[PDB]
Amino acid sequence: TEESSAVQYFQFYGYLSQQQNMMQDYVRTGTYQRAILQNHTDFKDKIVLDVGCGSGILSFFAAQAGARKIYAVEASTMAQHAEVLVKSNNLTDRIVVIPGKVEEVSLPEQVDIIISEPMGYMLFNERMLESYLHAKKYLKPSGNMFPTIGDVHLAPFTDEQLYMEQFTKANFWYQPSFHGVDLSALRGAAVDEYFRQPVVDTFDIRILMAKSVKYTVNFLEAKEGDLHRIEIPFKFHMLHSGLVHGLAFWFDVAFIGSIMTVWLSTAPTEPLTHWYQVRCLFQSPLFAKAGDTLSGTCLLIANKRQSYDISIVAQVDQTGSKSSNLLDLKNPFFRYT
Amino acid sequence: TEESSAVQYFQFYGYLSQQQNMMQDYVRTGTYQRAILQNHTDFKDKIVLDVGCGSGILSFFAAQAGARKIYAVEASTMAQHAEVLVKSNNLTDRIVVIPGKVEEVSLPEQVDIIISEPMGYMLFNERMLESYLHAKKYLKPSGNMFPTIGDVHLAPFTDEQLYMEQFTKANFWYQPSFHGVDLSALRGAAVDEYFRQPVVDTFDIRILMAKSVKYTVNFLEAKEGDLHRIEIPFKFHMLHSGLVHGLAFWFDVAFIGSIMTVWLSTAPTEPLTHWYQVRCLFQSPLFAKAGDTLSGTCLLIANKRQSYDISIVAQVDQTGSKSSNLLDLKNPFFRYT
Numbered sequence A, B: 001t002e003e004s005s006a007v008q009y010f011q012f013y014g015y016l017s018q019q020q021n022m023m024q025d026y027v028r029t030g031t032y033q034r035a036i037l038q039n040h041t042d043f044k045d046k047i048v049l050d051v052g053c054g055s056g057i058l059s060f061f062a063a064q065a066g067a068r069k070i071y072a073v074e075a076s077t078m079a080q081h082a083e084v085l086v087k088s089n090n091l092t093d094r095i096v097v098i099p100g101k102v103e104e105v106s107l108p109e110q111v112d113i114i115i116s117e118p119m120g121y122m123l124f125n126e127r128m129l130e131s132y133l134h135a136k137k138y139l140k141p142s143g144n145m146f147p148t149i150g151d152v153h154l155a156p157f158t159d160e161q162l163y164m165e166q167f168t169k170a171n172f173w174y175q176p177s178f179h180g181v182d183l184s185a186l187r188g189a190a191v192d193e194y195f196r197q198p199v200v201d202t203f204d205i206r207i208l209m210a211k212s213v214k215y216t217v218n219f220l221e222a223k224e225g226d227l228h229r230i231e232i233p234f235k236f237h238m239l240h241s242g243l244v245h246g247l248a249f250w251f252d253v254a255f256i257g258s259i260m261t262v263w264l265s266t267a268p269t270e271p272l273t274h275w276y277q278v279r280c281l282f283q284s285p286l287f288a289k290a291g292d293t294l295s296g297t298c299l300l301i302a303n304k305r306q307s308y309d310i311s312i313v314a315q316v317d318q319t320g321s322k323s324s325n326l327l328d329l330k331n332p333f334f335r336y337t
């Protein structure tokens, strides 16, 4: 249920250990600080909204950059820990913690810039992007958003070790005589379940088999409802022959400031973040020769558990080998070791 | 929030991978098979109820031991998978899968024996023993329960590294300029948070500083309401001199049949199971010399998140030095590697 999902979600962010986990991602936290500070003219004497402030860390960055007032909105119990920090850092004159959902609070005034870290796995997990876009009801016409745009990248990979490892787990249910019991009527249900799990992990970029396809969301322009159904068509130009075990996903965000654009990338070519990368495995790999085209569509449909039902249909155009897959982005396999 | 937690509980058990996890625990599954088959006379031509059948595994063991009729009750969507297995194993005559909660379904008849694996971390986690006890509304007055009794053991331990580890982690917050922010005001809260988590992990039995104290539930005699509040007084006479950092918890169940008694043990002296062992730290270590008496109470108080608040108060009688902790069993720290 939606209210069940929502309770668990904010409980997760009420834990200091989880705020600490995001904060200690130096690539993420340092890149946000650089975006904000190297774009200080965007903050200096301005009014700011921090959507989902957590510990308050990005609001402190806005304050360092010279913001006149910052409304730091937070819906989990972390709001009271943030207020302790604002007090102990002598920033009560500038940072104003507002406990509650950004959809439900009411701010004293319109803001010049909204800052947030609303990104989940594959960019869209957690559906916090919708809360981020919802918050534009508080943005002046002249306003900016940090991050400004989000790019989802998508590329086909070959990874037999990963495929076999997931296949093997599923094939527990291929046993005709587990303690004397035939389990094998469930084998297909087991493969279905195991391959519904996106794989959160990093990998060697040499496993990638074609140039990534890019899907862009402009946060300045997008509307909340735009994220209910996200359709990403793709046509890859195969650069290596081999078996395509699935699609790898990562994302970049850009902070498009008046002084400079700063990028935060979770690309596997880049230093690792707590988002790693995400792979959706095909239940059976597609064979492709270099020079082939692999085309289809990834479709994300917003569900009531603050995430997305993902469907990926991909086909090797030359042979018509087709793979069709459903993935539950809510429930990944965290493989990283 | 009670309704909420139950939703997530049954969804967890709808995953074949979570069923697989328990089935793959050889100690657990193999011991249940041996208990049932070695007590074949408690099953041959008998009526059985399996409370929470999951995959159906235990019901298949009751069929192997010759049961005439087995009602396999299951609340999660795993009931549909259980039925597929009953059909493919050609046991539709003998095993009847009934989808629903054991508190809400109706059975066509009274049973000779109830089987279940309702045990959680330190026996009581998940509160499934209450459903097991509830199920006795279906038991004939002569009837038996497999398992028949459950023993929880508590013993004081010394583990300096485990204790110090809590601070090491919390001291993330003890810095004056994390990206320009003074985080130190939240160090006490981060300490409290880590200490509230029971630690799931195994350990060398040599850390144990006294003979265990045992608390026994007899499933034949006990009522559902008996499990709402579990008061475990203790008086440990210290086998060794050192610092007591907390209490370690494990459990055993006995299958008391007509032919023999079979034990399933999760003790640290036994082969490891998926339950590991559980440790609850004291907020402050207690010094005790060998021959000293460490006395107090462990109070387990059921909550509406299908778990228990754990309240431990202890003192060294000879010194009056006291300590306590309050832990949330729903959110343990899984430390095992």
Ligand SMILES: Nc1ncnc2c1ncn2[C@@H]1O[C@H](CSCC[C@H](N)C(=O)O)[C@@H](O)[C@H]1O
Residues within 6 Å of the ligand: A009, A010, A013, A014, A022, A023, A051, A052, A053, A054, A055, A056, A057, A058, A073, A074, A075, A076, A078, A100, A101, A102, A103, A116, A117, A118, A128, A131
């Ligand atoms: N609709 C909403 N209203 C207010 N807070 C929200 C929200 N949706 C998510 N959040 C909060 O947003 C935070 C996202 S994690 C980011 C935390 C912090 N800004 C940092 O960058 O380190 C969580 O604390 C979560 O509770």
Ligand SMILES: Nc1ncnc2c1ncn2[C@@H]1O[C@H](CSCC[C@H](N)C(=O)O)[C@@H](O)[C@H]1O
Residues within 6 Å of the ligand: B010, B013, B014, B022, B023, B051, B052, B053, B054, B055, B056, B057, B058, B073, B074, B075, B076, B078, B100, B101, B102, B103, B116, B117, B118, B128, B131
């Ligand atoms: N009150 C209740 N009524 C029916 N099923 C329940 C229940 N409480 C827990 N369960 C189910 O009981 C199972 C416990 S796990 C045990 C699974 C299986 N008997 C085995 O031994 O491997 C889970 O499948 C869970 O969904």
